[PDB]
Amino acid sequence: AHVVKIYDTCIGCTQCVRACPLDVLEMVPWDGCKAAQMASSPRTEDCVGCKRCETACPTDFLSVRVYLGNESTRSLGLAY
Amino acid sequence: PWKQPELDPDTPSPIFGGSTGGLLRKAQVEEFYVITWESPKEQIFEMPTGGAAIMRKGPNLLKFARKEQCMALTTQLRSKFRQTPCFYRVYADGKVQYLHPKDGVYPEKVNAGRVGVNQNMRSIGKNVDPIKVVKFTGSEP
Amino acid sequence: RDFLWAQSSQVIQSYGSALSAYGLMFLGAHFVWAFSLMFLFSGRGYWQELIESIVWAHNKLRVAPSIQPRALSITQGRAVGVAHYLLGGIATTWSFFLARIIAVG
Amino acid sequence: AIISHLNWVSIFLGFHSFGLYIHNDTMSALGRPQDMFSDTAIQLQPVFAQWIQNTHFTAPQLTAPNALAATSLTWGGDVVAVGGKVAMMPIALGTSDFLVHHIHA
Amino acid sequence: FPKFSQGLAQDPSTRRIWYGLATAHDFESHDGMTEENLYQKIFASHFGQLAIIFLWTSGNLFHVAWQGNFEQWVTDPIHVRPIAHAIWDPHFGQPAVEAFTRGGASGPVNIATSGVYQWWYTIGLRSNQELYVSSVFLALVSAVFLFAGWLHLQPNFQPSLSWFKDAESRLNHHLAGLFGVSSLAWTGHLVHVAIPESRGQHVGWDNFLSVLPHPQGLTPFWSGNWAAYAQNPDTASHAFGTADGSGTAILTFLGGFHPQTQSLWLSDMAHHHLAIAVLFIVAGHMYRTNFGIGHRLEAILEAHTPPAGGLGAGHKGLFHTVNNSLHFQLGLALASVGTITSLVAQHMYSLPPYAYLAVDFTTQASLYTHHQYIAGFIMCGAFAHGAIFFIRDYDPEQNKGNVLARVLDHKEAIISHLSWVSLFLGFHTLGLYVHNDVVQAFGTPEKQILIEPVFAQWIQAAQGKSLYGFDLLLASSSSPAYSAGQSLWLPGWLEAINNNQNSLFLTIGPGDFLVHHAIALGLHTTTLILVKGALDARGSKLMPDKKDFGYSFPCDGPGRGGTCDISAYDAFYLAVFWMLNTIGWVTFYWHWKHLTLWQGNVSQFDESSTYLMGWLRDYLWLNSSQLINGYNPFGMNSLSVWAWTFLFGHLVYATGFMFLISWRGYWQELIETLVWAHEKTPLANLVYWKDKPVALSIVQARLVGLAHFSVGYIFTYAAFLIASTAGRFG
Amino acid sequence: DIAGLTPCSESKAYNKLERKELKVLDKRLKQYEPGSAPYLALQATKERTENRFKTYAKQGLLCGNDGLPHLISDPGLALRFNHAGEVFIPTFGFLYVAGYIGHVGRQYIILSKEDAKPTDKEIILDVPLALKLAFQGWAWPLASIQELRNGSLLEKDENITVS
Amino acid sequence: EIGPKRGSLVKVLRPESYWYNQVGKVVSVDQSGIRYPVVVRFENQNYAGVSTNNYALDEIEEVK
Ligand code: CLA
Ligand code: CLA
Ligand code: CLA
Ligand code: CLA
Ligand code: CLA
Numbered sequence A: 001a002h003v004v005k006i007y008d009t010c011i012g013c014t015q016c017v018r019a020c021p022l023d024v025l026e027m028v029p030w031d032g033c034k035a036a037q038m039a040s041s042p043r044t045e046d047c048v049g050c051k052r053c054e055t056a057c058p059t060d061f062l063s064v065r066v067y068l069g070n071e072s073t074r075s076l077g078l079a080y
Numbered sequence B: 001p002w003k004q005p006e007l008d009p010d011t012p013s014p015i016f017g018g019s020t021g022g023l024l025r026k027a028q029v030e031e032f033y034v035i036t037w038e039s040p041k042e043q044i045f046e047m048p049t050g051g052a053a054i055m056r057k058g059p060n061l062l063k064f065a066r067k068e069q070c071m072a073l074t075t076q077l078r079s080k081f082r083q084t085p086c087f088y089r090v091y092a093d094g095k096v097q098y099l100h101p102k103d104g105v106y107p108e109k110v111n112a113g114r115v116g117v118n119q120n121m122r123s124i125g126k127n128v129d130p131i132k133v134v135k136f137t138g139s140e141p
Numbered sequence C: 001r002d003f004l005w006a007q008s009s010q011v012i013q014s015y016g017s018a019l020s021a022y023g024l025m026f027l028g029a030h031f032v033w034a035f036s037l038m039f040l041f042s043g044r045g046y047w048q049e050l051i052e053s054i055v056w057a058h059n060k061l062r063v064a065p066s067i068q069p070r071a072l073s074i075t076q077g078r079a080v081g082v083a084h085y086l087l088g089g090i091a092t093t094w095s096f097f098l099a100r101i102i103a104v105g
Numbered sequence D: 001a002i003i004s005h006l007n008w009v010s011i012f013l014g015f016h017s018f019g020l021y022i023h024n025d026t027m028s029a030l031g032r033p034q035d036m037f038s039d040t041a042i043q044l045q046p047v048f049a050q051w052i053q054n055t056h057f058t059a060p061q062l063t064a065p066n067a068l069a070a071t072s073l074t075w076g077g078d079v080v081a082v083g084g085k086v087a088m089m090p091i092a093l094g095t096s097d098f099l100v101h102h103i104h105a
Numbered sequence E: 001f002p003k004f005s006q007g008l009a010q011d012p013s014t015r016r017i018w019y020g021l022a023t024a025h026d027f028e029s030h031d032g033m034t035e036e037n038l039y040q041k042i043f044a045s046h047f048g049q050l051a052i053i054f055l056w057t058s059g060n061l062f063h064v065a066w067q068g069n070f071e072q073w074v075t076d077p078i079h080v081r082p083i084a085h086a087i088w089d090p091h092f093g094q095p096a097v098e099a100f101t102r103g104g105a106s107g108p109v110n111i112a113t114s115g116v117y118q119w120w121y122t123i124g125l126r127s128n129q130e131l132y133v134s135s136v137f138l139a140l141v142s143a144v145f146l147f148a149g150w151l152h153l154q155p156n157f158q159p160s161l162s163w164f165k166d167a168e169s170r171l172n173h174h175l176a177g178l179f180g181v182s183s184l185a186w187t188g189h190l191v192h193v194a195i196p197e198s199r200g201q202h203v204g205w206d207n208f209l210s211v212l213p214h215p216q217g218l219t220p221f222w223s224g225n226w227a228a229y230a231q232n233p234d235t236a237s238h239a240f241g242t243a244d245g246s247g248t249a250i251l252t253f254l255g256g257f258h259p260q261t262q263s264l265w266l267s268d269m270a271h272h273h274l275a276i277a278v279l280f281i282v283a284g285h286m287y288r289t290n291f292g293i294g295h296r297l298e299a300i301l302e303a304h305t306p307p308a309g310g311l312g313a314g315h316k317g318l319f320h321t322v323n324n325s326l327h328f329q330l331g332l333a334l335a336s337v338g339t340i341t342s343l344v345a346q347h348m349y350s351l352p353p354y355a356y357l358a359v360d361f362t363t364q365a366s367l368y369t370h371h372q373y374i375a376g377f378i379m380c381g382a383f384a385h386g387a388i389f390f391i392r393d394y395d396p397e398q399n400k401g402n403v404l405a406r407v408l409d410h411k412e413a414i415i416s417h418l419s420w421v422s423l424f425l426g427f428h429t430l431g432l433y434v435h436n437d438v439v440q441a442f443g444t445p446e447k448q449i450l451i452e453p454v455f456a457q458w459i460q461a462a463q464g465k466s467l468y469g470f471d472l473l474l475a476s477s478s479s480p481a482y483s484a485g486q487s488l489w490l491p492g493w494l495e496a497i498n499n500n501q502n503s504l505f506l507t508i509g510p511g512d513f514l515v516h517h518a519i520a521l522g523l524h525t526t527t528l529i530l531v532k533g534a535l536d537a538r539g540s541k542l543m544p545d546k547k548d549f550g551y552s553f554p555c556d557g558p559g560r561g562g563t564c565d566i567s568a569y570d571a572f573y574l575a576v577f578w579m580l581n582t583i584g585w586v587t588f589y590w591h592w593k594h595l596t597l598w599q600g601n602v603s604q605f606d607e608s609s610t611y612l613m614g615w616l617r618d619y620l621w622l623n624s625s626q627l628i629n630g631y632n633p634f635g636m637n638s639l640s641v642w643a644w645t646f647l648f649g650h651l652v653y654a655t656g657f658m659f660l661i662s663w664r665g666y667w668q669e670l671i672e673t674l675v676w677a678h679e680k681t682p683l684a685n686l687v688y689w690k691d692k693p694v695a696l697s698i699v700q701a702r703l704v705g706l707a708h709f710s711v712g713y714i715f716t717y718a719a720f721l722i723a724s725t726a727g728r729f730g
Numbered sequence F: 001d002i003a004g005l006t007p008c009s010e011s012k013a014y015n016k017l018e019r020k021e022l023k024v025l026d027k028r029l030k031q032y033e034p035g036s037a038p039y040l041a042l043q044a045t046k047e048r049t050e051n052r053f054k055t056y057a058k059q060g061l062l063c064g065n066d067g068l069p070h071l072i073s074d075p076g077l078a079l080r081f082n083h084a085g086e087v088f089i090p091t092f093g094f095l096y097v098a099g100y101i102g103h104v105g106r107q108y109i110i111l112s113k114e115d116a117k118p119t120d121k122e123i124i125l126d127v128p129l130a131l132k133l134a135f136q137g138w139a140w141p142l143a144s145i146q147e148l149r150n151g152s153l154l155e156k157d158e159n160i161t162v163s
Numbered sequence G: 001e002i003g004p005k006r007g008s009l010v011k012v013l014r015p016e017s018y019w020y021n022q023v024g025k026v027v028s029v030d031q032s033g034i035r036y037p038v039v040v041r042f043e044n045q046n047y048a049g050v051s052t053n054n055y056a057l058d059e060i061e062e063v064k
């Protein structure tokens, strides 16, 4: 039940998508960049709040931020 | 993909003696995950929970309690052996859900069908202060 | 009582004798032990921000390092703690024993 | 299974070993020294160690006939004095030596 | 279970239970909140804290009257020890009840340390009946407040938001009535009751109307001859209870202490709270409220803007900032209350206000230490609650160009200068202490760097102390400041300050110099840790938007080199360690300097406080002899309870090191292993938790470990302070 | 005198402390022989101790009731009562040395940053340049006021801020 | 030409940036209507280790 918002400064590196294990980020076409790509966060219900993605973002400041919030079974990474 | 592949719950599993990292009471009650892939030969691979196991030529199937345990294995197979796995989510009611290649193409490659979600059309920062939203939830949305 | 509060009399009263070095190391070891607590209890976030406000003054006077200052890494912070922690914890005994036993009883 | 079974032992020891120390402290402060764990008290003596001390002490007679004496005097015997100071003398094990040997485990 | 928050109730783990308690009284973040419902819920809750106060006081009176020796203490206050409450512990043995029954009472008891006996005796309480009657009075007042918190929450009797945001009416009613009239009445009590009770006369509800306080009555008050009430003051040879050596005065300006009871004259304190009532009533008629006259608060702030522009817009825009921000109003109140709490500590030990308090050495310590420790805790809250204002209740566009934005603009200069002061104070103070530790050790105690605090000795000479020989204005008979106040206060004041057997302006040496400098280092660094967490609360270069996350969060991740302990909560977290360190030094310096005075050997502190080994040898190790022998293998004394607590603190302090050093990730993997065992066990698996077990969160452990850390840092000293002073009785 | 302190020459405890510290060595000197090296070592320590006490008395120091010398910090009382060498004069001695370290390091930083790869110059110093600046800093106060009055000391809002 | 010249130094004006009121070389500029075309390179690294970032026209200004 975490929140994942991506901002206007994305450049279509795809390093955020390759990093986050839980497949919570995918690439969508867009007209704003040279690469003509942008990220997205359709399924944040599966977000474990690891925050690996933010590390991948190579911009001056993060175009992808994971604002932690209410917890859940999927978010707490509980096998039980 | 062209069409979602339905689950074949009766396929041969790898040759693995067993371990203690398996499934717990949560699996029967709440949900569990299963992963499928197709190998060309008999090989050895590291399991996320436990030790080593031997794949089987043809389809293979595992059961896990977490999505990270499954995707951890996809990254190993896609890199080491260069395969194309696909995994589902099974609830206690018997319902099945097809998760990771939901469009058939992996998320790190674009596709025309996809639609953006949680996309702010502004720069990081450049957003209202919390005082403006002091009595309801959210400064980022 | 009978081990610490008693056998610590030879170390404390070492000032003015040949065992004076053990009395100093007895205190010095307590300093390094506590000093470790800054590293174990805190985190690299508070320190990296503090250096920014310090870099401003070093920048204001045009005296700043080309090698940017960065706070100690999380793993290093933990290592630096246990090192100064063990050193102070072990060196105390090294002073509390040799002074006690050289001045026999 | 390893970490689980080993977790149970640590909790077993810390309670039954360290908790015995607190029991003696609480009994003494309340004025009930008869209820402590001590020699004049609810003795817990290490029988296994005491038996091994005598066995190694009475070895020259039977198990090692050509041995003129025992390996050390810690097992048993008489004092060895040098320069007015004792070099080694038999060490006796009691209720305290039972708690400490367990504290180490 | 949390009804105020649905987000936590859906949580299946134990994090729901812990976070439900900590976010309980944080009304702003609750679900479905409104600004109007917020003030009402606060107004009702503030009635509650009053209810516990008046009940807590009622419990002390009852438990003292029923179980204490107040009747026996007044007859021989010096020798008899007070009694706080009795003891019933069935786990005792026979030697303990024989040791703990030191008091005259039959069963075992606890000796008091607060000083309420000296306080109640001074204001005119001389019986246990009068305490029973009082305990009922506050319990009634306590129930009345509980009824009000419920009453003033109902649909009717529900104050509107405009009523809360009426500052001009609150000041006038609170300054005039709560402060002034209360201070006026307390003078009415000291005059009509207490001063007679000192001079033998028994005044009570039966006879307070018939008995006059003064022989003349009120006719001097109307005629204007107000000096008639200061004619025949009490003589020096005056017993505090009997009429031997008494007088007729009710208001006087004698100054100094009473000879027998080394305490302030009652007639002075009566005269004191009168003048305070006059200024505070006058100040109450200042602001404007429903009449044409009066000042306005907003008009004043807008006016005090300097023309040149050193402060820019100045104090404009601040009224709506303060009046709308509750955290702003709370930081100022704690800042003011925290400081006052230190004054109560500094000004009581030097100027004893109560009878036979200077003689009770154990009681002076506890009160000074308790006020000083609370001072730091209250002060920390003012900054912390000041940092929350910058996140939640700060609007930059409204507060543009004003003093508050101009401070936040150049914060890199403030934090830089603060850091320099702490570094310079810390390096020099540690150096002087080390240089003397060594040079003592090599047998040369004359090579020490002992610097005399000339500036402070200059003051004491300018305030009557003729020892140093500076011959300042008020130490000189020719000056006018000596001439003025010569008939009023100086004969009583000069006698006390020059007496070197009281705590009024103690002699100062080079050892007191280093201790004061060490304190300054602690105060400056503690502020730097807090100030930084406030100004950098909104954003840092490492985290440009902290304001979006909140006051308290884990970290922003292992990226950007590491962001662990950035939040403003983590600054407050680190300051408490320093706070305790600072108050420790302040308090260690009070105790030892007073022990040497009480033991008579002042040379102990002057020669040994210049090097650190003196603090470890002569203060800590030496005075921890009678305490540590509380329960010996031979027997047990009455100090066994303190030695047990002594260790209890040493232990709690160490348990916090676990939560501080060892983090979460080691433990959650461990709890996953116990979970496996609970399910695979044959019979225990039938039992299953309702809420899933997980390790404690990151922020929770910082809090928990600090509690185990501070409680050990208090329970250890309290035992050492009381046991060291009680066993020697001096 | 001032502050109720006696001079160290007139004090009794000061001489008491001298007779004590010498008695320890005389007792320690009895064990060894006259012509041995331990004897020569202790006699030197005796000679130094006798010199330490007389020199502190000759310097007009102030000893308290404990018998140890005290220092005075206000320059007014220091100059009035002839106690300036204690604190007031040590302050100027240190500031000249502290300023020298600053003026030197500030110049090495500025000059290396005018060239390529200044990061390498910090870990691998230019020792010929460092010695040149280190022997040119004798008149560091002149250059500071020269640089302040000129205005090339401080930077002007070309620095990073955070909000 | 839409923007600053190649190889020209410029000063940044993003308040969020590590390089704020600091100078960097212009590596390139795109003239296809992108929101953040101006590519800039600095010598000093940021906290992560990146020494480049795409800035906008309004966010950059002339040196010193
Ligand atoms: C004095 C401080 C202190 C204490 C009390 C403990 C206690 C414990 N530690 Mg820690 N340790 C400490 C310091 C301390 N540690 C510090 C500072 C560090 C930092 C390195 C560590 C790091 C650490 C690690 C990493 C681990 C432990 C483990 C343990 C647990 C081992 C199991 C056990 O023996 O429990 C037995 C119970 C006791 C020892 C308590 C003794 C007191 C008595 C017996 C309790 C009396 C209860 C009373 C009768 C009931 C009153 C109820 C009341 C409400 C009415 C135990 C609870 C291990 C663990 O938890 O896993 C098993 C674990 O692996 N320790
Ligand atoms: C007039 C006094 C006053 C008032 C009205 C408030 C009001 C408030 N404070 Mg504040 N505060 C104060 C003084 C005050 N504070 C002081 C003096 C400090 C400094 C210590 C603080 C520090 C402080 C912090 C740091 C925070 C608040 C927060 C809050 C909010 C409520 C949080 C809540 O429900 O916690 C309920 C909490 C509990 C019920 C847990 C308290 C448990 C304590 C620590 C355990 C004590 C030890 C134990 C009982 C000892 C027993 C001994 C044993 C041997 C038996 C609320 C606005 C919070 C807030 O606004 O969040 C945004 C917040 O984060 N306050
Ligand atoms: C600051 C004001 C103040 C305070 C704190 C005291 C305190 C005290 N007085 Mg005193 N007194 C005062 C003013 C004050 N007096 C004035 C102005 C006079 C002149 C008439 C007296 C005359 C006086 C006499 C003659 C006697 C006392 C006594 C007492 C003691 C016991 C009272 C008791 O148990 O309640 C008993 C209470 C009652 C019998 C009823 C009181 C009725 C008043 C009007 C109610 C006030 C309630 C107030 C509004 C509460 C605040 C909460 C509010 C929101 C409801 C106590 C030390 C008695 C004693 O033994 O002292 C040595 C005693 O005999 N007083
Ligand atoms: C492993 C053995 C051991 C350990 C771990 C501890 C640990 C502790 N003891 Mg302790 N103690 C021990 C053995 C031990 N003790 C023995 C054998 C005895 C004799 C029987 C004592 C007697 C004792 C007493 C009487 C007290 C402690 C206290 C404490 C606690 C103080 C911690 C702190 O940081 O406060 C702060 C540390 C300091 C303020 C500095 C320490 C003392 C310095 C030298 C004073 C300097 C003050 C002065 C201003 C100079 C400093 C300024 C600086 C700039 C130069 C601490 C947890 C104290 C306590 O309960 O905590 C409040 C306490 O009063 N112990
Ligand atoms: C030329 C080097 C240099 C210069 C000119 C300055 C100058 C300054 N520093 Mg500083 N600093 C330096 C190096 C330097 N620093 C280094 C290497 C460190 C890391 C330990 C720091 C850490 C530091 C802190 C934490 C603080 C300052 C602060 C300050 C300001 C107040 C003075 C002070 O008390 O600082 C402190 C002095 C030291 C910590 C001693 C520095 C170590 C040596 C003595 C200096 C290094 C000289 C260099 C290695 C020699 C190279 C010469 C070259 C020819 C080879 C001041 C403008 C304070 C401030 O912010 O101002 C308000 C402050 O809080 N500095």
Ligand SMILES: CC1=C(/C=C/C(C)=C\C=C/C(C)=C/C=C/C=C(C)/C=C\C=C(C)\C=C\C2=C(C)CCCC2(C)C)C(C)(C)CCC1
Pocket (backbone or CB within 6 Å): E327, E328, E330, E331, E332, E335, E336, E339, E382, E383, E385, E386, E387, E389, E534
């Ligand atoms: C962050 C924040 C904050 C902060 C706070 C604080 C913390 C403050 C402070 C502080 C304090 C707490 C202070 C105090 C003080 C005091 C003072 C400053 C004083 C003084 C002085 C004087 C004027 C004096 C005089 C005199 C007399 C009267 C007589 C005799 C002589 C003498 C000199 C003593 C706030 C909330 C605000 C807001 C925002 C946020």
Ligand SMILES: CC1=C(C/C=C(\C)CCC[C@H](C)CCC[C@H](C)CCCC(C)C)C(=O)c2ccccc2C1=O
Pocket (backbone or CB within 6 Å): E658, E659, E660, E662, E663, E664, E667, E694, E695, E696, E697, E698, E700, E701, E702
């Ligand atoms: C031991 C430990 C745990 C695990 C500790 C646990 C699970 C103990 C808490 C549960 C026990 C059962 C409560 C014990 C009862 C208390 C003595 C009394 C509590 C009183 C309250 C109800 C008021 C953490 O989760 C943790 C998290 C982060 C940093 C450090 C640590 C850490 O050190």
Ligand code: SF4
Pocket (backbone or CB within 6 Å): A006, A009, A010, A011, A012, A013, A014, A015, A016, A017, A038, A039, A056, A057, A058, A059, A063, A064
């Ligand atoms: S990691 Fe950042 S820059 Fe790269 S594609 Fe994602 S949002 Fe864009």
Ligand code: SF4
Pocket (backbone or CB within 6 Å): A004, A019, A020, A021, A022, A023, A024, A025, A046, A047, A048, A049, A050, A051, A052, A053, A054, A066
């Ligand atoms: S929080 Fe973790 S799991 Fe979720 S999107 Fe970011 S990196 Fe992926």
Ligand code: SF4
Pocket (backbone or CB within 6 Å): C043, C074, E554, E555, E556, E557, E558, E562, E563, E564, E565, E663, E698
């Ligand atoms: S708080 Fe823990 S998880 Fe967060 S950055 Fe620090 S070490 Fe890593």
